[PDB]
Write a protein that binds this ligand. Structure first.
Ligand SMILES: CC(C)CC(=O)C(=O)O
Ligand SMILES: CC(C)CC(=O)C(=O)O
Ligand SMILES: CC(C)C[C@H](N)C(=O)O
Ligand SMILES: CC(C)C[C@H](N)C(=O)O
Ligand SMILES: [Zn+2]
Ligand SMILES: [Zn+2]
Lengths: 577, 575
């Protein structure tokens, strides 16, 4: 159970701090400087602001995949690979094919099926045993180019307790691997081979030893500015604060031999919740490249989140060179592949991150939005192309395909739930959002009364009295409609044709100055039985004669056909409100 | 939808980087130094400091966390969170915004009237600067033995312009008038040890010189002393840049604020760029005294800084957080109950997966580390559980937080059908169909072939050739249908009436021995546009001349005809 800390305060603890010593076994843990080494008074990274995208490398198919409760099926691997290509990643670690037969099979498939674009380089992980390196080259046979990423653990702790080995011995593991790579590359001249070396558990390794091993590997590989080597420096375990990782990167960047022939790569994990920070400060410290995963998947606490890194650049005016314009599509694909949810509060992608619940936040957002519109109007400009200036929202949610949501509480609650339970309507999410904004400007009765005044009651400018639907009998035929409607109270007769009743009615309305451009449509039964009422919902960008507004309409009727027509009328009248 | 970046690479972009420019509208966003101001601090010292003591913690779960929930805390859940925070060792706890929320008001009353506050705990209440709101705040706190009144107003460049439409002098006056009102009210309420906190809200969007001015001026009104200090709390209301810049701003504030001996400098970072924990740790190294956050990072949007990560980050580097985390599962269970939001599988220290190793190589290394520890423990007559933790891949002994190390040794139907085929299957259909799939990994193309074979292709026993729908012109009138169908290859006419075309068609089928009792029905567009195809789904209990529960699926350019196809598909599924 939880025991309130009751030990004495620290000597010198201020009297305004009444905290007490816990009984947690702090004696079993040491500061980083004592655990590993003291690490740079003339650092420059604190004075550098990132002004370009790094070279990204996506490791979802390897570090991500091996961290899953359910590793990816062949379909899932391919869907993830295709997503990363489409987003614009050019280096993608496709697996560990020498250690994993399913990974071997996957690398063969993408090579043999021509799934790899000419500007994409696949990367494959291997440990250093020579038979594993041979299997690695074999997996990539026929690729036009590939990165062979080999590694071994170099940390003080692993050298002692895992290897029981001296510095020379652990270095030879790496340099023997490098020699084997050079030998294998010569055997496969139809592939442009490139190399990446990681001193694994780098953050548990003396910098001078990490440098010595990388330098020695480079001597074997013999890279040049035209054919560089990647030295990848992982926080295999995140051990300390990100400024210390950044100092370590700046030291490596300054001190590694033949720096002009090196692409310096970062591989941070998230044990202390600071991976994103480690990557950003590390990149400012001189790194060239960052490995991570979409939405921070990967071993234990995960690899650094590539989404957060990329949009942290976008939102400060730096092009990440990756497309995040539909973050929900990225999220849904990632959740399908990984079978792990993106958290409600995850930066940029989480369900709740574009929501405002506080009245004062909602008011300030509205004011920001209004002021942007006023400035756009004066500059004869599209508000969506102008400087984003809205309190509480770091980005326009529309720039990643999301929507600002002003959430209104119902005093189990919530608009969606009450509407379904009390009134039998399942509102599409975008309707819930639009309606809540209306409510914003509540008891169940107030919410219902507001819903009916908005969507169900209006009879101006458009009322639909009755209609004759002439549907062709054969599949693929035309449906035509003549409708009796009142336009601002004036009875008239409209006619249109289309591929169904909704299309026909939309076309009939166009002739009388309601342009209804349909964006979406949903319908459901409000109970069981073939004689149930149907509730229909239509989303439309609507322009009325004598600018366009995207709005929803709702229609309810015993005929599935008529319910959809009522939803169109509802939408038109909502656009006039 | 996702379009591969195709724009020209940047001038000077290295040849070994073949990334192309995205079409994201980056011109709508400016660097932080242009949006707000450049870094004012000279000779920073935070990069050279390693934290060696716990800060003063303040938990804001009951205010910032609570107001951010879709299902806000009931009175029972509030008390449970309050009790947890007390039992963990928190000494400052923000219990609500009582002048804005009657439920918060009642909760503050409850804990004061019940004598629920330990002698070493100070409750904290948030208020805006308006004098009636300040009055109602002191009303809520009436009878508290001690209380922090935390008043604030927005000071950012942006909010001054578009929210308040006010200048610097006017916005400073709002703060300084709120402070005067606080002093007046405190003098009217005896006995209570009143203490104050002021936040320049949206501090990260505010010029530092100006934030310093407003704070100084508020401090002049309150007149704090080293024995009765004021808290200046500097929020990253929105996390706007990298955590080193936030830390630079805190160092500058700590070095430049007046009456520094009478100031507790407090941080309140939110997580919009994923760096709240870093902002707090570097900020603390920069001279702050105090950190506001929530357990497991609840709070507006991306949340407040995680108190659990911050506390255990100290513990795992040998610094006592002065908070008990010895049973993180209990903490997590209680937080999940109170917030009704899960702790993510990968959340530092508390997530489901954070002490699991799936790699055979990692598991080997972990065992070797545990063995060397056990060896040393024997060679020293010590319990291993009290020795220095020395285990690859595991930053802490999971047992130290009441957890265990775990050496551990699916159709995608909804996603595939929606993504590749534009069908949003009803949940019960997803279930029914994934059962067909399980029986048959089946690839996406095989899944589609099976779906078509089941719901779309069958033409026996029932085939619908064509039909005439005679729809009611008037709302509430009868709709009739007559259709030409084939019943096991035999062409026949069916006809029926009902309150709509679906009811008419099922009445028509009943005459020929196909009894379709409809249980549910859904339809949606398969793309944008008024000419889009509709997909319809009908659930029914079908009896062919017994109550077989089935789904049918229909696709057509007519909303009406798609529904008729779905009825036919259900009948054929039933046979
Ligand atoms: C080769 C390394 C990058 C292995 C790894 O994932 C790590 O060290 O974190
Ligand atoms: C008074 C402030 C600390 C309000 C707040 O929650 C914030 O600025 O983040
Ligand atoms: C699917 C719908 C948006 C409309 C359909 N094309 C009809 O006219 O009935
Ligand atoms: C709501 C639906 C199940 C059917 C509706 N009664 C119709 O006949 O069109
Ligand atoms: Zn890794
Ligand atoms: Zn906050």
């Amino acid at each position: 159970t939880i025991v309130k800390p009751a030990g004495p305060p620290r000597v010198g603890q201020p009297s305004w701090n009444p905290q007490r010593a816990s009984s947690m076994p702090v004696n079993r843990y040491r500061p980083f400087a004592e655990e590993v080494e003291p690490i740079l008074r003339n650092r420059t990274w604190p004075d550098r602001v990132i002004d370009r995208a790094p070279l990204w490398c996506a490791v979802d198919l390897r570090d991500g995949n091996q961290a899953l409760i359910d590793p990816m099926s062949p379909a899932r691997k391919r869907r993830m690979f295709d997503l990363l290509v489409r987003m614009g990643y050019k280096e993608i670690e496709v697996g560990f094919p020498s250690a994993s037969q399913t990974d071997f099979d996957f690398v063969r498939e993408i090579i043999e099926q021509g799934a790899i674009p000419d500007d994409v380089t696949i990367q494959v992980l291997t440990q250093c045993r020579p038979e594993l390196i041979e299997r690695t080259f074999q997996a990539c046979s026929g690729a036009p180019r590939a990165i062979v990423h080999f590694y071994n653990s170099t940390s003080i702790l692993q050298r002692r307790v895992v290897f029981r080995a001296n510095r020379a011995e652990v270095q030879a593991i790496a340099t023997d691997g490098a020699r084997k790579c050079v030998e294998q590359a010569a055997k496969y001249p139809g592939t442009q081979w490139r190399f990446e070396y990681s001193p694994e558990s780098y953050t548990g390794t003396e910098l001078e030893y990490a440098k010595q091993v990388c330098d020695a590997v480079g001597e074997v590989i013999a890279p040049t500015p035209e054919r560089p080597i990647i030295f990848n420096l992982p926080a295999t375990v995140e051990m300390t604060t990100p400024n210390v990782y950044a100092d370590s990167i700046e030291w490596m960047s300054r001190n590694l031999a033949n720096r002009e022939s090196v692409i310096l790569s970062l591989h941070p994990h998230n044990d202390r919740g600071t991976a994103v920070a480690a990557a950003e400060l590390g990149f400012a410290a001189g790194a060239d490249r960052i490995e991570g995963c979409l939405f921070g998947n990967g071993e234990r606490t995960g690899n650094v989140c590539l989404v957060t890194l990329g949009l942290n650049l976008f939102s400060r005016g730096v092009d990440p060179q990756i497309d995040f314009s539909n973050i929900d599509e990225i999220r849904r694909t990632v959740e399908y592949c990984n079978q792990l949810p993106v958290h409600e509060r995850h930066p940029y992608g989480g369900d709740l991150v574009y929501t405002a619940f506080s009245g004062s936040h909602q008011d300030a957002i509205n004011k920001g939005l209004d002021a942007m519109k006023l400035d756009a109007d004066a500059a004869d400009c599209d508000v969506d192309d102008m400087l984003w200036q809205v309190p509480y929202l770091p980005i326009d949610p529309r720039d990643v395909g999301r929507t600002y949501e002003a959430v209104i509480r119902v005093n189990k609650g919530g608009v969606a739930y009450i509407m379904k339970t009390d009134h039998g309507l399942s509102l599409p999410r975008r309707l819930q959002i639009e309606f809540s904004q209306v409510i914003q400007k509540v008891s169940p009765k107030e919410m219902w009364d507001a819903f009916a005044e908005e969507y169900l009651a209006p009879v101006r400018p458009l009322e639909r009295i009755r209609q004759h639907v002439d549907a062709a009998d054969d599949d693929g035929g035309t449906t035509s409609i003549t409708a009796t409607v009142k336009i601002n109270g004036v009875e008239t007769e409209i006619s249109g044709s289309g591929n169904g009743p909704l299309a026909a009615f939309v076309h009939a309305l166009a002739d009388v100055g309601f342009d209804v451009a349909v964006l979406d449509y949903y319908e459901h039964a409000m109970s069981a039985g073939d004689d149930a009422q149907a509730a229909a919902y239509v989303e439309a960008s609507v322009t009325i004669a004598s600018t366009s507004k995207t709005v929803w309409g709702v229609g309810i009727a015993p005929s599935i056909t008529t319910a959809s027509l009522r939803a169109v009328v509802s939408a038109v009248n909502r656009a006039a409100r």
